[PDB]
Write a protein that binds this ligand. Structure first.
Ligand code: WPU
Length: 133
């Protein structure tokens, strides 16, 4: 029952500062433009100890499956090859990606009827809000 309130199909409804987050990450111009247009659906499911988070969009589709606290390989939508670890901290999913000596953290939280995704690269934060699809 760990992540019950995250499970479901979610649609992006707002974004703030994502272009500046992507710049800080190192994403190039053309990818930022096309990635910034996308309105993804995020599909979260749980089977036993395995959590799956899928993103379906016109830009890229991504999918990760993982066990909390257990590092895995991830290919991001912008084609970084990163080493990821996801934990639950006080009801918040905390996703840390490491690559080329860099790090970025993505937090996913339930707030009212929304799922809020906060992405931080150094001093730059983007907030992306999802509602049930
Ligand atoms: O809303 C989201 N759901 C995800 O998996 N996303 C966004 C924020 S962080 C990650 C992403 C997507 C595209 C690019 Cl280009 C980058 Cl750098 C990061």
């Amino acid at each position: 029952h760990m992540c019950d309130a995250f499970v479901g199909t979610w649609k992006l409804v707002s974004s703030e500062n994502f272009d500046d987050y992507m710049k800080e990450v190192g994403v190039g111009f053309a990818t930022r433009k096309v990635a910034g247009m996308a309105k993804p659906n995020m599909i979260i499911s749980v089977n036993g100890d395995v959590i799956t988070i899928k993103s379906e969009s016109t830009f890229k589709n991504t999918e990760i499956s993982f066990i909390l606290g257990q590092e895995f390989d991830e290919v991001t939508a912008d084609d970084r090859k990163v080493k990821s670890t996801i934990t639950l901290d006080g009801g918040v999913l905390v996703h840390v990606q490491k690559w080329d000596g860099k790090s970025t953290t993505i937090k996913r939280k339930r707030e009212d009827d929304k799922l809020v995704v906060e992405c931080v690269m150094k001093g730059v934060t983007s907030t992306r809000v999802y509602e049930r699809a």
